[PDB]
Amino acid sequence: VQKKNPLRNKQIMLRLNPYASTFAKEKLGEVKAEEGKPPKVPASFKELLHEA
Amino acid sequence: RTYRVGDIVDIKVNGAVQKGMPHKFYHGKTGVVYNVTKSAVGVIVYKRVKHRYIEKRINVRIEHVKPSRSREDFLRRVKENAELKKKAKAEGVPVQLKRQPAMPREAHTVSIADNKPVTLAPVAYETTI
Amino acid sequence: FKQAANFLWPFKLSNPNGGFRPRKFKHFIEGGDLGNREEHINALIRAMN
Amino acid sequence: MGRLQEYQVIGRHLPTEANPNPALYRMRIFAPNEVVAKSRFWYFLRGLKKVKKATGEIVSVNVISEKHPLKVKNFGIWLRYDSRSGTHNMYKEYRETSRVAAVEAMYADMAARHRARFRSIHILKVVELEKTEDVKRPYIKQLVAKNLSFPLPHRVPKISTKKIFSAKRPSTFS
Amino acid sequence: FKRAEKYVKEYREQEREKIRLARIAKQQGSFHIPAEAKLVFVIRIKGINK
Amino acid sequence: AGTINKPKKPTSKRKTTRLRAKISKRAAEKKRKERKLARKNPEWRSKLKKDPGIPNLFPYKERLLQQIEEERIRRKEEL
RNA sequence: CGGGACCGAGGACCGCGCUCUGCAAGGAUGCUGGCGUAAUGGUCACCAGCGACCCGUCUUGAAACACGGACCAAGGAGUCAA
């Protein structure tokens, strides 16, 4: 009798998708990047970027 | 070339005789032969008027008529469809029988070591000098 | 994808919140809103949905 | 013509059997966004190398940020603009802190002084004047002068437009 | 539930894979050309007149 | 003239619809006519336009010409 | 996580579900105040803001031109037969 927005009503979200509660609890929208020291940009990329 | 009734032909009026052509609409059109003459041929053409097709008939000299290759691809595709289907039944492996539209290109890597890019300006400096 | 997209009804969106560009009926590269805008369609989807 | 960014756009012809490794072409495009940058890049290739967008591809799109945006710099711009007579060369100078700001000031300046639009202006070269003697235009020469100091006569005070009535006559001395 | 978990994991891995390929090409001194888009959303923004 | 003390009849800047339509039709017919004369233009036209070149007040024109020479000698050596 | 506006369609239960003694899950209920009458509401006249050429007919593609109309009551024009 009434279409309810699942993005506003959490119960419709849990009805249509049981994994939404697990997503919210485990915070899978806030996953940090993999650890490790990032290697620096090669020089030739920089001379190519700043070449007139 | 001796043309026959039912053959599908293309109309191309060769030469620069476009100064006094009565009907330039049928140049580059494709039609079906219904009448054959020693130096003439009868061609059925269809014209589109709004939502319906009207049927026209023209008499074209043989010098402006070439056989069309409209059904060549269809007959050819029927042939290799039959042959590869027989081959697939022989070897017991599935094979594609449907031609597909062009798909977008995938990811790939372009090397720079021997192909250093050239910087271009909106005009060439060799032309400036 | 064909069956899923044909099962989906065409989406009836509202007018964008914040509006269109000042001259709407030009190309996206010209300062309007027609044509291909690539990944910039997402802001228009947020505004119209 | 807007909040412009400078893009390094590299593109090429599509590889074929005859040419497995086509040449790469790089341009520096001042465009509001990457779509406009790629469109201008393909426009320039259609104008020069006869390479169409349908038969070519884009290898790279990168943003060229200014190295030192906090340093005051002088920029010389050599450009061509189209009018009813035809195409004309112009060399102009701008005192800015980034190439993109110099290009925006250029676009506003040409629109104000010659009514030329974005599509009628071709940017051929933008250079840094590394020395003071390389400055040619007097309106930049007066600004690069030694011990520059000036007052600001007749400064209208900033009053909020919603405050309709004032009780005292304002002063234009500060 | 399991299928949605798999889909979320696949989305995260494909994003990290595109980022990793771009970084590997940049580190090796080349440019990774991404695959062209397979999905387009189209919106009609002009009327039915003329 | 005595325009300050005794002005004459004002020149109206308010256009009329008939004049606007007539001027638009004249502009359209002039555009079509100049297109037709451009198609039937017998005047000779150069294949390559006359390029003005580099301005003299450009401070790096000399090193640009140096770049042009090293480019053309490199191209001649490659070819 | 706040602040605001408009709306409450249906009428025992059934279904999908969830945070599972219950529930924000197939559409509003609970508590309280004043009044119980012209108070709400409706009609008429007028003022105010905004909007708004006099109808019918003819013509052509259309307007314009032209024709009819002082007012009211009654009558008044695609019927019958083969």
PDB file of all heavy atoms in Angstrom, chain D residues 141-153:
ATOM      1  N   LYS D 141      56.269  46.446 -16.128  1.00  0.00           N
ATOM      2  CA  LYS D 141      57.529  47.101 -15.785  1.00  0.00           C
ATOM      3  C   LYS D 141      57.353  48.087 -14.636  1.00  0.00           C
ATOM      4  O   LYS D 141      58.259  48.259 -13.812  1.00  0.00           O
ATOM      5  CB  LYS D 141      58.113  47.805 -17.008  1.00  0.00           C
ATOM      6  CG  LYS D 141      58.766  46.868 -18.008  1.00  0.00           C
ATOM      7  CD  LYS D 141      60.008  46.217 -17.422  1.00  0.00           C
ATOM      8  CE  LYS D 141      61.142  47.216 -17.280  1.00  0.00           C
ATOM      9  NZ  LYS D 141      62.386  46.573 -16.778  1.00  0.00           N
ATOM     10  N   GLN D 142      56.197  48.750 -14.567  1.00  0.00           N
ATOM     11  CA  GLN D 142      55.945  49.665 -13.459  1.00  0.00           C
ATOM     12  C   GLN D 142      55.687  48.912 -12.160  1.00  0.00           C
ATOM     13  O   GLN D 142      55.887  49.466 -11.073  1.00  0.00           O
ATOM     14  CB  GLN D 142      54.771  50.588 -13.786  1.00  0.00           C
ATOM     15  CG  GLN D 142      53.444  49.880 -13.982  1.00  0.00           C
ATOM     16  CD  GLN D 142      52.280  50.844 -14.069  1.00  0.00           C
ATOM     17  OE1 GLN D 142      52.448  52.052 -13.907  1.00  0.00           O
ATOM     18  NE2 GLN D 142      51.090  50.316 -14.324  1.00  0.00           N
ATOM     19  N   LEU D 143      55.244  47.657 -12.247  1.00  0.00           N
ATOM     20  CA  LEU D 143      55.004  46.861 -11.052  1.00  0.00           C
ATOM     21  C   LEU D 143      56.257  46.151 -10.557  1.00  0.00           C
ATOM     22  O   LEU D 143      56.353  45.857  -9.361  1.00  0.00           O
ATOM     23  CB  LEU D 143      53.903  45.833 -11.313  1.00  0.00           C
ATOM     24  CG  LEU D 143      52.505  46.409 -11.546  1.00  0.00           C
ATOM     25  CD1 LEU D 143      51.540  45.319 -11.977  1.00  0.00           C
ATOM     26  CD2 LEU D 143      52.006  47.115 -10.298  1.00  0.00           C
ATOM     27  N   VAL D 144      57.210  45.868 -11.439  1.00  0.00           N
ATOM     28  CA  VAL D 144      58.461  45.234 -11.034  1.00  0.00           C
ATOM     29  C   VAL D 144      59.530  46.273 -10.679  1.00  0.00           C
ATOM     30  O   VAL D 144      60.703  45.932 -10.545  1.00  0.00           O
ATOM     31  CB  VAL D 144      58.976  44.252 -12.098  1.00  0.00           C
ATOM     32  CG1 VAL D 144      57.944  43.174 -12.373  1.00  0.00           C
ATOM     33  CG2 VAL D 144      59.359  44.982 -13.373  1.00  0.00           C
ATOM     34  N   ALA D 145      59.137  47.535 -10.518  1.00  0.00           N
ATOM     35  CA  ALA D 145      60.093  48.590 -10.214  1.00  0.00           C
ATOM     36  C   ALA D 145      60.610  48.467  -8.785  1.00  0.00           C
ATOM     37  O   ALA D 145      59.959  47.893  -7.909  1.00  0.00           O
ATOM     38  CB  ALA D 145      59.456  49.964 -10.419  1.00  0.00           C
ATOM     39  N   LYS D 146      61.805  49.015  -8.563  1.00  0.00           N
ATOM     40  CA  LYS D 146      62.438  48.938  -7.254  1.00  0.00           C
ATOM     41  C   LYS D 146      61.714  49.825  -6.249  1.00  0.00           C
ATOM     42  O   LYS D 146      61.345  50.962  -6.556  1.00  0.00           O
ATOM     43  CB  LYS D 146      63.906  49.355  -7.356  1.00  0.00           C
ATOM     44  CG  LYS D 146      64.685  49.226  -6.058  1.00  0.00           C
ATOM     45  CD  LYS D 146      66.143  49.603  -6.244  1.00  0.00           C
ATOM     46  CE  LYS D 146      66.881  49.599  -4.915  1.00  0.00           C
ATOM     47  NZ  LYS D 146      66.979  48.228  -4.344  1.00  0.00           N
ATOM     48  N   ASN D 147      61.521  49.285  -5.038  1.00  0.00           N
ATOM     49  CA  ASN D 147      60.881  49.972  -3.911  1.00  0.00           C
ATOM     50  C   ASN D 147      59.478  50.448  -4.284  1.00  0.00           C
ATOM     51  O   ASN D 147      59.180  51.644  -4.244  1.00  0.00           O
ATOM     52  CB  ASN D 147      61.747  51.135  -3.404  1.00  0.00           C
ATOM     53  CG  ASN D 147      61.375  51.596  -1.996  1.00  0.00           C
ATOM     54  OD1 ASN D 147      60.204  51.680  -1.627  1.00  0.00           O
ATOM     55  ND2 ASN D 147      62.393  51.899  -1.201  1.00  0.00           N
ATOM     56  N   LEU D 148      58.620  49.517  -4.689  1.00  0.00           N
ATOM     57  CA  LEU D 148      57.268  49.874  -5.094  1.00  0.00           C
ATOM     58  C   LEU D 148      56.389  50.108  -3.875  1.00  0.00           C
ATOM     59  O   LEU D 148      56.231  49.226  -3.027  1.00  0.00           O
ATOM     60  CB  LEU D 148      56.679  48.772  -5.976  1.00  0.00           C
ATOM     61  CG  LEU D 148      55.260  49.001  -6.494  1.00  0.00           C
ATOM     62  CD1 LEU D 148      55.239  50.133  -7.503  1.00  0.00           C
ATOM     63  CD2 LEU D 148      54.710  47.729  -7.107  1.00  0.00           C
ATOM     64  N   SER D 149      55.818  51.306  -3.794  1.00  0.00           N
ATOM     65  CA  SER D 149      54.934  51.666  -2.697  1.00  0.00           C
ATOM     66  C   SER D 149      53.972  52.734  -3.187  1.00  0.00           C
ATOM     67  O   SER D 149      54.385  53.735  -3.778  1.00  0.00           O
ATOM     68  CB  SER D 149      55.721  52.168  -1.481  1.00  0.00           C
ATOM     69  OG  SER D 149      54.852  52.686  -0.489  1.00  0.00           O
ATOM     70  N   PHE D 150      52.686  52.510  -2.940  1.00  0.00           N
ATOM     71  CA  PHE D 150      51.651  53.424  -3.395  1.00  0.00           C
ATOM     72  C   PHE D 150      50.551  53.466  -2.347  1.00  0.00           C
ATOM     73  O   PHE D 150      50.330  52.480  -1.636  1.00  0.00           O
ATOM     74  CB  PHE D 150      51.085  52.994  -4.762  1.00  0.00           C
ATOM     75  CG  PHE D 150      50.706  51.537  -4.843  1.00  0.00           C
ATOM     76  CD1 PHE D 150      49.450  51.106  -4.440  1.00  0.00           C
ATOM     77  CD2 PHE D 150      51.598  50.603  -5.344  1.00  0.00           C
ATOM     78  CE1 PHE D 150      49.100  49.775  -4.521  1.00  0.00           C
ATOM     79  CE2 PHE D 150      51.251  49.269  -5.428  1.00  0.00           C
ATOM     80  CZ  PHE D 150      50.001  48.856  -5.015  1.00  0.00           C
ATOM     81  N   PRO D 151      49.851  54.588  -2.222  1.00  0.00           N
ATOM     82  CA  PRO D 151      48.647  54.630  -1.395  1.00  0.00           C
ATOM     83  C   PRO D 151      47.435  54.141  -2.180  1.00  0.00           C
ATOM     84  O   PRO D 151      47.534  53.714  -3.331  1.00  0.00           O
ATOM     85  CB  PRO D 151      48.517  56.117  -1.049  1.00  0.00           C
ATOM     86  CG  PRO D 151      49.110  56.810  -2.215  1.00  0.00           C
ATOM     87  CD  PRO D 151      50.198  55.918  -2.754  1.00  0.00           C
ATOM     88  N   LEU D 152      46.276  54.213  -1.526  1.00  0.00           N
ATOM     89  CA  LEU D 152      44.998  53.834  -2.122  1.00  0.00           C
ATOM     90  C   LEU D 152      44.018  54.984  -1.917  1.00  0.00           C
ATOM     91  O   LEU D 152      43.219  54.969  -0.969  1.00  0.00           O
ATOM     92  CB  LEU D 152      44.466  52.534  -1.523  1.00  0.00           C
ATOM     93  CG  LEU D 152      45.328  51.289  -1.737  1.00  0.00           C
ATOM     94  CD1 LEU D 152      44.792  50.120  -0.931  1.00  0.00           C
ATOM     95  CD2 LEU D 152      45.396  50.937  -3.212  1.00  0.00           C
ATOM     96  N   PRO D 153      44.066  56.006  -2.769  1.00  0.00           N
ATOM     97  CA  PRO D 153      43.135  57.128  -2.625  1.00  0.00           C
ATOM     98  C   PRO D 153      41.712  56.731  -2.981  1.00  0.00           C
ATOM     99  O   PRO D 153      41.480  55.887  -3.851  1.00  0.00           O
ATOM    100  CB  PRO D 153      43.679  58.171  -3.612  1.00  0.00           C
ATOM    101  CG  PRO D 153      45.071  57.709  -3.948  1.00  0.00           C
ATOM    102  CD  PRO D 153      45.000  56.222  -3.884  1.00  0.00           C
TER     103      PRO D 153
END
